Amino acid sequence: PISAGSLKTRLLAQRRTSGTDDWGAPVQGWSDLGLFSGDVKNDTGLGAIRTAAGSGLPASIAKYSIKVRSEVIRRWSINSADRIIGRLPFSTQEMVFSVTGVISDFADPSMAYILVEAGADEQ
Amino acid sequence: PISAGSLKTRLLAQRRTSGTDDWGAPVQGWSDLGLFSGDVKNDTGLGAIRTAAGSGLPASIAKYSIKVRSEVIRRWSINSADRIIGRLPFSTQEMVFSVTGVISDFADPSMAYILVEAGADEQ
Amino acid sequence: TNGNLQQIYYSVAAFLTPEQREQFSANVAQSVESGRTPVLEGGIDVKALGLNPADAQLLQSRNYSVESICRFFAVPPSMIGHASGSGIEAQQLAFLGLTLAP
Amino acid sequence: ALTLAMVQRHLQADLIEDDERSYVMEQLLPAARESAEMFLNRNIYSTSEELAAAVAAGTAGQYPLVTPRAVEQAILLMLGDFYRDREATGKPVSTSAHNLLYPYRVKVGV
Amino acid sequence: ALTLAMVQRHLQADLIEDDERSYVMEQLLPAARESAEMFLNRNIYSTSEELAAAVAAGTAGQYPLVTPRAVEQAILLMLGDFYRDREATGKPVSTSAHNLLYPYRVKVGV
Amino acid sequence: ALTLAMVQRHLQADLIEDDERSYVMEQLLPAARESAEMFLNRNIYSTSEELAAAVAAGTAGQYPLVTPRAVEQAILLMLGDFYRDREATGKPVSTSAHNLLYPYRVKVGV
Amino acid sequence: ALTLAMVQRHLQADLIEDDERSYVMEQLLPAARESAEMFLNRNIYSTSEELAAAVAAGTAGQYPLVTPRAVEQAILLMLGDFYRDREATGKPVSTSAHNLLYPYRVKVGV
Amino acid sequence: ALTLAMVQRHLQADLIEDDERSYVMEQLLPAARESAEMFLNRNIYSTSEELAAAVAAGTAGQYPLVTPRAVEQAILLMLGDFYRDREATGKPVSTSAHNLLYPYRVKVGV
Amino acid sequence: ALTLAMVQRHLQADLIEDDERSYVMEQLLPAARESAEMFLNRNIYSTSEELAAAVAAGTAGQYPLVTPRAVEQAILLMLGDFYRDREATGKPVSTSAHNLLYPYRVKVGV
Amino acid sequence: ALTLAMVQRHLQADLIEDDERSYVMEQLLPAARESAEMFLNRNIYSTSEELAAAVAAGTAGQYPLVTPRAVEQAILLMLGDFYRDREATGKPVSTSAHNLLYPYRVKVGV
């Protein structure tokens, strides 16, 4: 029960180049992986967005969830250190998702859940 | 499934003039953007209003949610740094909303959610 | 030719192009000509319509019209039963003395 | 007029990738056009010049019409149905497209 | 009067983009107008000048009328139905637009 | 009396923008008035002087009445229905407006 | 007695604003009163003086009565129904006001 | 005995304001009394002296009774119904008050 | 055209692995194709060359056609049904693929 | 072709343990094959050489066929049903496998 055709969004998964710069911080250049399809589930309801983050620094972060077929998790290895780019229809501003982990289900081996952050763009 | 005709309220979106004053604080003058239509969803139930805020300073803040068509998010770019003005019918006191972020849905590309604050007027 | 004498009507729960209509009719004719039995696979169905050809053909009305014409021309409908007293010789006597004298 | 702009606007989905656009505009729209053209019991042509060409070549049958806007809307509805769900389920015949297409049917009979 | 302002206010939508404004005003409105025209069994014209011009050329059929407000709002209701749902789910044959359109129908019978 | 004040109070929505007011008072109220005037099988005029003028010009038909308050209330109910929902759905005939309008019907027959 | 105080207490509303007080007391109350008057098949007058005055001028029909309290509360119930819902949703023909109004009905039959 | 104390205790609402008390005791209780007195097909008087006065004046009809406690309870039930809900809905005839009032009906027939 | 790209876009699946691509394109697609072929009561061929070749060898039966787009999408719908559920739950006999396939059926009857 | 790869891909469960693989491929698949071969009222052989061998040995009955893809798909559906649930419940006869298998039945009669 995966019900194809609800996977109406074309995302773009991509990971980071290996190594470190002079200081040791992660390299702010991004490679490419490919394209897949998924069903995005929002957080409807009041108080679904987080404003403050840390030392009183303003923000606006709202977590989502992408349901993908089980093949995209075996072809690559998506984990917490990737980012996902999706573009809203007829728009030039593209959302940047930050993968916070992948939940896999054993009830049926045809689904997987990727939980993203979507709040602040990553570099 | 947007069901026009439930969008019975005429709001007024407007953003802030760029630059800073002598001290660097945001300029307290407000420009204009235009008018749109949306469906406002309250927070019914007890304890839906927040009284204290910080160093024991009294307040009364109750967050709302505006459901708008997908066009008003592509025409402009509404983010956390705007404010929305709406007027109650047959009244001279106008609510001032403070946008805290926009949630967009990918299940269908014909809706968007603007979460506002409505508690203390902005300047 | 109006189609008021038809008895059996087939029915299929789908949309068919006319060519399928001629094909269905030809298939029914072939099946009945070869001595087989209909089976009505799938969604096909048949209903029989409760008609009476005597009521379609108006036999009572036409009989009354015949009688009325005979009465109109002053010829008794039972004169010698030309339209539909024991002895025959009396029948001609009645015919004469009631219709032909004037 | 079944242009790429109209299809993109109807489906609310921009088709930038070449494979997806090829699928939608070469396997999915023509299927809806064929289905409507078969339900109407007549040939439909997009423009008058194509109808004249078909009449000249003799392939045009009885009662051919240039496509009006209602038939375009019904074809778009069928295309949206094809794009939304992609499995064979027990959906009923005489959907909402057949309500619009019905006055253009020609050889209705029994 | 089925102008752009009335359509904008009915749908509660701003048609700023050229593409979607063209879609709504050139493929979605004529479909509804000609669907109502087919249901009414008569031709409907916007103004008296168009009716007179059509009668002069003889292309106007018998029993023509210039559109009242009830027919215009029935057309608006059909357009609003077209904008909202974009599939072939299957609906009742007689909607709420036909209740408004019915008293202007002509040539009813068996 | 179908004044702007009465319409604003009924719909519970002030109409300050010129386009919205034009829509409501020039496309939406006249549609309800036409629909009620067609259901009643008679002509309705707001004031007695207009009725006299129509009689003089000869355009007034049989059984014309000056609009009572019940017909105004029913017209307002139809207007509120038009303003609330803007899509064609399977709503039933003989709504709650026809209960109020019914005693004023004139040529009921079979 | 259908004064302003009784209407204020029935609706649990303070009609301070001139506009909405005018609406409720000049378009929403006469509608209910004349609807009940049409249902009862007779004319109803507030006081004996008005009944005598109407009989003197001959405009009062046969079987007139001055309103009892039951008819006044039926009118109040109709007004309360009018205030609450402002659309044409579709309702049963015989409501709870007719149960109160029925024993005063006249000229019933076939 | 339909005293202010009994009404206050039944409705569970003290009536201190003059307008509210006037409404309840001059528009709402008499309506229930009239309705019950009309359903019973007979005249009901609170006390024997009033019945004798009515008989003397000749206005008392056939079968007049001094009100028993069951009729008081039924009148109170109708009053509570009037006080609770204030809109005309599709409530059914033969409520729970008519069960108590029924043995006192006089001219039941067909 | 029932290539690999169309199947990939229909199922929204990337068939990178050799094993599952072989499964889908060699056991799951021919099943649907021959099921539709059995339902249609005729043989269907991909291109004109294959039809001519089959007719030359005589193995092609009477009434053959080269596949239109509607039959191809019916096959795609059957394949999408096969991919989704993999059990024998029990389903209606006439699905949504048969509605598309029916106008091409031949040799119907009793 | 009822290979280990096809079975593993259909059931979405790799069978690495020897006991589980033995169970699935020696008690569960042959049961589905026997059930389908008994419902078809005919013998089915995987390959043509085996059919020729069976004909030579004389054990092949009337109307034997080499298994097409539809019968393979139906056998896989029955196998998936056997693998999913493992208790006897009140499931209905004529499941979704019998829809695919039915055109291959031979001795249907009464």
Side-chain angles (χ1 to χ4, degrees):
Chain A
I2 182 56
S3 186
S6 85
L7 302 171
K8 48 184 70 168
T9 52
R10 280 293 262 181
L11 272 297
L12 167 62
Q14 65 183 177
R15 62 158 37 88
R16 181 178 260 134
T17 44
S18 309
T20 72
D21 58 352
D22 273 348
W23 287 73
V27 192
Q28 313 214 330
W30 284 100
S31 173
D32 192 303
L33 278 183
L35 283 72
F36 64 96
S37 64
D39 185 21
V40 191
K41 197 192 94 166
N42 54 57
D43 190 341
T44 192
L46 310 165
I49 196 153
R50 151 185 189 177
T51 59
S55 309
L57 277 165
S60 74
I61 293 165
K63 56 214 174 304
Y64 296 166
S65 176
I66 312 175
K67 181 174 72 68
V68 298
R69 213 170 272 268
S70 177
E71 280 141 19
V72 308
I73 314 289
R74 300 189 256 110
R75 188 210 206 161
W76 310 301
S77 282
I78 303 296
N79 48 359
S80 169
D82 288 3
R83 89 165 164 183
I84 304 185
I85 292 179
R87 204 211 310 299
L88 190 67
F90 319 115
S91 189
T92 53
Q93 311 271 59
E94 50 176 19
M95 295 296 172
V96 170
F97 298 150
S98 296
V99 173
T100 54
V102 169
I103 290 177
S104 70
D105 43 8
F106 296 89
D108 74 5
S110 60
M111 294 182 286
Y113 298 88
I114 308 179
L115 302 104
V116 287
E117 211 56 12
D121 62 358
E122 204 178 311
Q123 282 219 292
Chain B
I2 182 56
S3 186
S6 85
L7 302 171
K8 48 184 70 168
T9 52
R10 280 293 262 181
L11 272 297
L12 167 62
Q14 65 182 177
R15 62 158 37 88
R16 181 178 260 134
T17 44
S18 309
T20 72
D21 58 352
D22 273 348
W23 287 73
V27 192
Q28 313 214 330
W30 284 100
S31 173
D32 192 303
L33 278 183
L35 283 72
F36 64 96
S37 64
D39 185 21
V40 191
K41 197 192 94 166
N42 54 57
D43 190 341
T44 192
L46 310 165
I49 196 153
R50 151 185 189 177
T51 59
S55 309
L57 277 165
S60 74
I61 293 165
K63 56 214 174 304
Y64 296 166
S65 176
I66 312 175
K67 181 174 72 68
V68 298
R69 213 170 272 268
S70 177
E71 280 141 19
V72 308
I73 314 289
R74 300 189 256 110
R75 188 210 206 161
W76 310 301
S77 282
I78 303 296
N79 48 359
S80 169
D82 288 3
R83 89 165 164 183
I84 304 185
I85 292 179
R87 204 211 310 299
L88 190 67
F90 319 115
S91 189
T92 53
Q93 311 271 59
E94 50 176 19
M95 295 296 172
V96 170
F97 298 150
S98 296
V99 173
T100 54
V102 169
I103 290 177
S104 70
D105 43 8
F106 296 89
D108 74 5
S110 60
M111 294 182 286
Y113 298 88
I114 308 179
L115 302 104
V116 287
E117 211 56 12
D121 62 358
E122 204 178 311
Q123 282 219 292
Chain C
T1 70
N2 271 337
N4 283 76
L5 293 188
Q6 191 70 225
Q7 275 296 332
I8 64 171
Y9 292 86
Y10 285 88
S11 175
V12 61
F15 293 134
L16 317 175
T17 55
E19 288 79 349
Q20 307 212 36
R21 308 209 206 105
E22 292 84 4
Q23 283 324 130
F24 203 109
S25 314
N27 199 346
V28 175
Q30 193 44 40
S31 162
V32 66
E33 181 295 310
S34 284
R36 277 144 45 188
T37 301
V39 299
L40 307 183
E41 61 76 13
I44 316 183
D45 185 45
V46 56
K47 66 175 301 204
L49 191 64
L51 293 176
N52 195 3
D55 296 305
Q57 299 271 45
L58 295 159
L59 313 182
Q60 314 214 330
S61 297
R62 195 181 305 116
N63 259 328
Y64 187 83
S65 287
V66 170
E67 169 173 59
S68 161
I69 301 296
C70 285
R71 183 198 299 113
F72 191 97
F73 278 106
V75 178
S78 66
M79 60 66 58
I80 307 173
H82 80 269
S84 82
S86 77
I88 290 300
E89 183 178 1
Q91 273 294 50
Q92 289 89 20
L93 262 187
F95 179 41
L96 195 149
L98 277 298
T99 308
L100 296 185
Chain D
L2 307 182
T3 318
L4 189 49
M6 303 276 178
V7 171
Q8 282 175 10
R9 274 290 179 244
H10 185 77
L11 298 186
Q12 297 265 70
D14 54 338
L15 311 170
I16 53 172
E17 209 180 335
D18 271 356
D19 196 4
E20 172 91 358
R21 184 141 41 61
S22 175
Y23 166 66
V24 172
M25 302 275 318
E26 301 206 60
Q27 174 54 239
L28 188 64
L29 185 73
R33 195 161 44 221
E34 292 290 328
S35 179
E37 183 178 1
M38 182 85 47
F39 169 69
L40 284 177
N41 296 317
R42 78 211 290 190
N43 281 137
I44 62 170
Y45 303 101
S46 66
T47 187
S48 86
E49 61 206 40
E50 190 156 59
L51 162 66
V55 160
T59 184
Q62 284 163 30
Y63 308 98
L65 60 81
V66 285
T67 300
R69 296 305 168 200
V71 183
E72 306 275 5
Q73 195 43 56
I75 287 174
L76 277 190
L77 292 191
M78 271 190 253
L79 167 69
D81 186 74
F82 280 169
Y83 194 82
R84 209 268 191 181
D85 48 50
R86 302 172 135 108
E87 290 99 29
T89 61
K91 291 174 71 175
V93 70
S94 199
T95 51
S96 164
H98 298 142
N99 294 333
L100 317 190
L101 278 177
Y102 199 82
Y104 296 100
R105 213 156 170 224
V106 61
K107 294 181 176 67
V108 57
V110 65
Chain E
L2 277 185
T3 76
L4 189 54
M6 309 276 110
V7 163
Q8 268 182 11
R9 304 251 61 91
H10 190 73
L11 296 178
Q12 300 276 8
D14 280 328
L15 301 176
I16 301 299
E17 291 171 31
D18 317 299
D19 194 37
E20 69 155 347
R21 161 154 56 82
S22 178
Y23 168 64
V24 173
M25 294 299 291
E26 272 144 30
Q27 210 283 308
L28 209 65
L29 187 49
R33 196 218 298 288
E34 78 186 25
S35 174
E37 201 185 0
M38 262 287 188
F39 169 70
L40 280 188
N41 289 316
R42 67 213 299 198
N43 315 115
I44 50 171
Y45 302 108
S46 311
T47 62
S48 304
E49 280 66 73
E50 320 186 350
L51 166 66
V55 175
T59 187
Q62 63 154 310
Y63 283 121
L65 61 79
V66 58
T67 53
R69 291 296 157 76
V71 169
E72 277 182 8
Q73 190 152 4
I75 283 149
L76 274 191
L77 270 169
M78 306 208 174
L79 164 68
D81 186 74
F82 280 161
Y83 205 69
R84 183 205 211 271
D85 56 71
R86 292 169 157 96
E87 305 158 30
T89 179
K91 295 182 184 293
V93 65
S94 174
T95 61
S96 169
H98 296 134
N99 295 349
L100 270 166
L101 277 184
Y102 207 110
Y104 303 100
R105 205 161 177 223
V106 68
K107 263 190 275 186
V108 306
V110 301
Chain F
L2 307 182
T3 318
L4 189 49
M6 303 276 178
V7 171
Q8 282 175 10
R9 274 290 179 244
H10 185 77
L11 298 186
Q12 297 265 70
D14 54 338
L15 311 170
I16 53 172
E17 209 180 335
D18 271 356
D19 196 4
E20 172 91 358
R21 184 141 41 61
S22 175
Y23 166 66
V24 172
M25 302 275 318
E26 301 206 60
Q27 174 54 239
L28 188 64
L29 185 73
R33 195 161 44 221
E34 292 290 328
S35 179
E37 183 178 1
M38 182 85 47
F39 169 69
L40 284 177
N41 296 317
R42 78 211 290 190
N43 281 137
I44 62 170
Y45 303 101
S46 66
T47 187
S48 86
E49 61 206 40
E50 190 156 59
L51 162 66
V55 160
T59 184
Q62 284 163 30
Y63 308 98
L65 60 81
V66 285
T67 300
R69 296 305 168 200
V71 183
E72 306 275 5
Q73 195 43 56
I75 287 174
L76 277 190
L77 292 191
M78 271 190 253
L79 167 69
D81 186 74
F82 280 169
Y83 194 82
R84 209 268 191 181
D85 48 50
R86 302 172 135 108
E87 290 99 29
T89 61
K91 291 174 71 175
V93 70
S94 199
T95 51
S96 163
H98 298 142
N99 294 333
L100 317 190
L101 278 177
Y102 199 82
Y104 296 100
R105 213 156 170 224
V106 61
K107 294 181 176 67
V108 57
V110 65
Chain G
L2 277 185
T3 76
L4 189 54
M6 309 276 110
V7 163
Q8 268 182 11
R9 304 251 61 91
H10 190 73
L11 296 178
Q12 300 275 8
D14 280 328
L15 300 176
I16 301 299
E17 291 171 31
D18 317 299
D19 194 37
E20 69 155 347
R21 161 154 56 82
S22 178
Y23 168 64
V24 173
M25 294 299 291
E26 272 144 30
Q27 210 283 308
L28 209 65
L29 187 49
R33 196 218 298 288
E34 78 186 25
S35 174
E37 201 185 0
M38 262 287 188
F39 169 70
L40 280 188
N41 289 316
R42 67 213 299 198
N43 315 115
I44 50 171
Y45 302 108
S46 311
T47 62
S48 304
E49 280 66 73
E50 320 186 350
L51 166 66
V55 175
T59 187
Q62 63 154 310
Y63 283 121
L65 61 79
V66 58
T67 53
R69 291 296 157 76
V71 169
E72 277 182 8
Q73 190 152 4
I75 283 149
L76 274 191
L77 270 169
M78 306 208 174
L79 164 68
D81 186 74
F82 280 161
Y83 205 69
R84 183 205 211 271
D85 56 71
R86 292 169 157 96
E87 305 158 30
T89 179
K91 295 182 184 293
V93 65
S94 174
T95 61
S96 169
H98 296 134
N99 295 349
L100 270 166
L101 277 184
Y102 207 110
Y104 303 100
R105 205 162 177 223
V106 68
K107 263 190 275 186
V108 306
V110 301
Chain H
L2 307 182
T3 318
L4 189 49
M6 303 276 178
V7 171
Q8 282 175 10
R9 274 290 179 244
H10 185 77
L11 298 186
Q12 297 265 70
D14 54 338
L15 311 170
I16 53 172
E17 209 180 335
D18 271 356
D19 196 4
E20 172 91 358
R21 184 141 41 61
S22 175
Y23 166 66
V24 172
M25 302 275 318
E26 301 206 60
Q27 174 54 239
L28 188 64
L29 185 73
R33 195 161 44 221
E34 292 290 328
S35 179
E37 183 178 1
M38 182 85 47
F39 169 69
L40 284 177
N41 296 317
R42 78 211 290 190
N43 281 137
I44 62 170
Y45 303 101
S46 66
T47 187
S48 86
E49 61 206 40
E50 190 156 59
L51 162 66
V55 160
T59 184
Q62 284 163 30
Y63 308 98
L65 60 81
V66 285
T67 300
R69 296 305 168 200
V71 183
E72 306 275 5
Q73 195 43 56
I75 287 174
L76 277 190
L77 292 191
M78 271 190 253
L79 167 69
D81 186 74
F82 280 169
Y83 194 82
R84 209 268 191 181
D85 48 50
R86 302 172 135 108
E87 290 99 29
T89 61
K91 291 174 71 175
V93 70
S94 199
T95 51
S96 163
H98 298 142
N99 294 333
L100 317 190
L101 278 177
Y102 199 82
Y104 296 100
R105 213 156 170 224
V106 61
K107 294 181 176 67
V108 57
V110 65
Chain I
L2 277 185
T3 76
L4 189 54
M6 309 276 110
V7 163
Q8 268 182 11
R9 304 251 61 91
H10 190 73
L11 296 178
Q12 300 275 8
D14 280 328
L15 300 176
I16 301 299
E17 291 171 31
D18 317 299
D19 194 37
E20 69 155 347
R21 161 154 56 82
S22 178
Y23 168 64
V24 173
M25 294 299 291
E26 272 144 30
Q27 210 283 308
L28 209 65
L29 187 49
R33 196 218 298 288
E34 78 186 25
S35 174
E37 201 185 0
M38 262 287 188
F39 169 70
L40 280 188
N41 289 316
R42 67 213 299 198
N43 315 115
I44 50 171
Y45 302 108
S46 311
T47 62
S48 304
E49 280 66 73
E50 320 186 350
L51 166 66
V55 175
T59 187
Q62 63 154 310
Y63 283 121
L65 61 79
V66 58
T67 53
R69 291 296 157 76
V71 169
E72 277 182 8
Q73 190 152 4
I75 283 149
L76 274 191
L77 270 169
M78 306 208 174
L79 165 68
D81 186 74
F82 280 161
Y83 205 69
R84 183 205 211 271
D85 56 71
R86 292 169 157 96
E87 305 158 30
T89 179
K91 295 182 184 293
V93 65
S94 174
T95 61
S96 169
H98 296 134
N99 295 349
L100 270 166
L101 277 184
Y102 207 110
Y104 303 100
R105 205 162 177 223
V106 68
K107 263 190 275 186
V108 306
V110 301
Chain J
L2 307 182
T3 318
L4 189 49
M6 303 276 178
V7 171
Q8 282 175 10
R9 274 290 179 244
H10 185 77
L11 298 186
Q12 297 265 70
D14 54 338
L15 311 170
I16 53 172
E17 209 180 335
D18 271 356
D19 196 4
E20 172 91 358
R21 184 141 41 61
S22 175
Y23 166 66
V24 172
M25 302 275 318
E26 301 206 60
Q27 174 54 239
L28 188 64
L29 185 73
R33 195 161 44 221
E34 292 290 328
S35 179
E37 183 178 1
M38 182 85 47
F39 169 69
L40 284 177
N41 296 317
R42 78 211 290 190
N43 281 137
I44 62 170
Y45 303 101
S46 66
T47 187
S48 86
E49 61 206 40
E50 190 156 59
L51 162 66
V55 160
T59 184
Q62 284 163 30
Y63 308 98
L65 60 81
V66 285
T67 300
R69 296 305 168 200
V71 183
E72 306 275 5
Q73 195 43 56
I75 287 174
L76 277 190
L77 292 191
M78 271 190 253
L79 167 69
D81 186 74
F82 280 169
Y83 194 82
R84 209 268 191 181
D85 48 50
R86 302 172 135 108
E87 290 99 29
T89 61
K91 291 174 71 175
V93 70
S94 199
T95 51
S96 163
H98 298 142
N99 294 333
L100 317 190
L101 278 177
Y102 199 82
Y104 296 100
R105 213 156 170 224
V106 61
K107 294 181 176 67
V108 57
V110 65

